[PDB]
Amino acid sequence: AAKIAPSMLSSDFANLAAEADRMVRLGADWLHMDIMDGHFVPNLTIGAPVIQSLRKHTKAYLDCHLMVTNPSDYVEPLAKAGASGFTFHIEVSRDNWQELIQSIKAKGMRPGVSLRPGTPVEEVFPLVEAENPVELVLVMTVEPGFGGQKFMPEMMEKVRALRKKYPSLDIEVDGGLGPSTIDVAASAGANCIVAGSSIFGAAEPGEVISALRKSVEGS
Amino acid sequence: AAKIAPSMLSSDFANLAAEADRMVRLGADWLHMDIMDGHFVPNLTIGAPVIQSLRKHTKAYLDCHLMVTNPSDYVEPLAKAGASGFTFHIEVSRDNWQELIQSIKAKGMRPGVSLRPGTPVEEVFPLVEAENPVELVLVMTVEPGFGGQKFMPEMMEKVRALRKKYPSLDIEVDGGLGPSTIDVAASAGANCIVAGSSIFGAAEPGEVISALRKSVEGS
Numbered sequence: 001a002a003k004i005a006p007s008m009l010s011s012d013f014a015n016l017a018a019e020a021d022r023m024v025r026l027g028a029d030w031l032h033m034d035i036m037d038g039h040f041v042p043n044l045t046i047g048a049p050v051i052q053s054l055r056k057h058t059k060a061y062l063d064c065h066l067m068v069t070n071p072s073d074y075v076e077p078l079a080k081a082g083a084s085g086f087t088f089h090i091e092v093s094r095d096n097w098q099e100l101i102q103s104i105k106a107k108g109m110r111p112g113v114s115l116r117p118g119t120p121v122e123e124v125f126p127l128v129e130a131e132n133p134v135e136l137v138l139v140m141t142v143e144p145g146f147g148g149q150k151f152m153p154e155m156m157e158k159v160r161a162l163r164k165k166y167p168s169l170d171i172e173v174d175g176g177l178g179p180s181t182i183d184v185a186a187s188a189g190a191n192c193i194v195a196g197s198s199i200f201g202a203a204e205p206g207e208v209i210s211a212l213r214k215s216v217e218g219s
Numbered sequence: 220a221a222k223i224a225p226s227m228l229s230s231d232f233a234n235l236a237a238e239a240d241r242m243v244r245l246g247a248d249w250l251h252m253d254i255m256d257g258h259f260v261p262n263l264t265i266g267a268p269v270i271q272s273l274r275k276h277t278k279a280y281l282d283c284h285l286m287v288t289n290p291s292d293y294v295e296p297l298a299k300a301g302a303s304g305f306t307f308h309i310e311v312s313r314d315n316w317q318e319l320i321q322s323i324k325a326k327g328m329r330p331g332v333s334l335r336p337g338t339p340v341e342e343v344f345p346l347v348e349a350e351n352p353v354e355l356v357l358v359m360t361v362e363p364g365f366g367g368q369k370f371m372p373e374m375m376e377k378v379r380a381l382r383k384k385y386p387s388l389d390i391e392v393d394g395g396l397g398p399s400t401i402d403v404a405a406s407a408g409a410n411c412i413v414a415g416s417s418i419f420g421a422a423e424p425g426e427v428i429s430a431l432r433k434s435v436e437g438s
């Protein structure tokens with residue numbers, strides 16, 4: 001199924017409640033929340049508290065991308081906060097993915113995993129195949145850090161690879177996605193698109209979302 | 220001079236723009252922003268991005284309290300974001316306070332320093348006396364982590380001590396400040412008060428602010 005989740009990171013943070021409600025109105029399936037602690041990536045954005053306050057205003061799906069080092073330590077707070085999706089990083093999740101995916105799941109959150117550009121795609125299959133597996137895989141399409149970097153087409157090799165072995169797994173692409181790049185990723189197998197400036201900086205935001213969706217469905 | 224800065228951390232994060240504008244209306248002199256990376260304290264709140272979006276909505280003074288480990292790395296972003304005051308922690312700022320205070324200053328922000336409960340007050344005098352010194356000292360009145368902890372009167376010893384040697388230095392108290400405790404701190408020497416639940420959870424928020432101020436001036 002197609003899923004177009006705007007990256008609230010490129011929105012008016014002073015007006016999350018507003019922005020969030022406006023994206024659904026325009027077609028937002030999910031709301032992509034990037035939580036960074038400045039240690040895993042040279043940048044600190046938002047944490048649990050935020051997520052929580054936002055849940056008191058919208059019932060939308062909150063896709064939480066955990067770019068932190070101590071993810072296990074966020075599972076409890078984010079759950080309470082009301083996160084819908086919890087996605088961790090294979091890099092720091094080495095050696096507990098099995099326990100982690102279970103903690104996440106047992107909290108009512110859809111567990112997911114992600115891998116930076118330079119991380120062999122193979123590394124997730126084990127996590128995608130486990131008894132209690134992740135239900136989504138996020139493929140970083142740029143070096144994780146700040147919004148506005150150049151889309152990396154090479155990363156598409158990972159999308160196709162995934163899509164082949166797993167025909168119905170939600171595959172998410174995050175970084176640079178927009179009209180100009182949606183197609184190359186749509187054909188690769190991505191069905192969960194995260195858009196940032198391509199939406200919050202468009203004259204026709206609603207339109208843009210409607211275009212990312214078609215792309216994916218026309219695939 | 221008295222300064223009553225509400226702690227935006229206890230506000231409706233989904234509506235910062237709103238909340239912030241509402242506090243000025245009621246009397247807020249400054250807006251206390253607590254930036255935590257989860258590594259210096261088991262909690263992650265908000266980072267530069269937020270601060271920035273918020274600057275596009277208000278001209279209020281943004282008092283930034285940096286509870287991070289790598290503070291020097293936030294000086295550049297916060298400056299651009301529009302922070303008015305940059306306050307770092309003596310614990311992690313050991314060995315560069317001189318260079319740090321200068322970086323902060325040279326960016327147009329008022330440099331400040333803070334010390335957890337268990338940190339000998341003496342440790343800041345050097346920083347308060349330097350050629351390019353800090354212009355404010357924050358005295359943690361509770362163990363740094365989450366809003367809602369018990370005020371620690373003992374910590375007042377530090378306020379008095381500071382106020383004595385430095386008669387006109389802005390002294391800030393953060394943690395549990397409210398009507399019930401403003402006086403003990405007002406008499407000690409504190410003139411910059413940071414209030415959280417005592418304001419955002421009051422029936423007469425505006426009134427509360429007016430009460431914290433009198434306390435201080437009646438001193």
Ligand SMILES: [Zn+2]
Binds near residue numbers: 032033034065174194
């Ligand atoms: Zn993301």
Ligand SMILES: [Zn+2]
Binds near residue numbers: 251252253284393
């Ligand atoms: Zn503070």
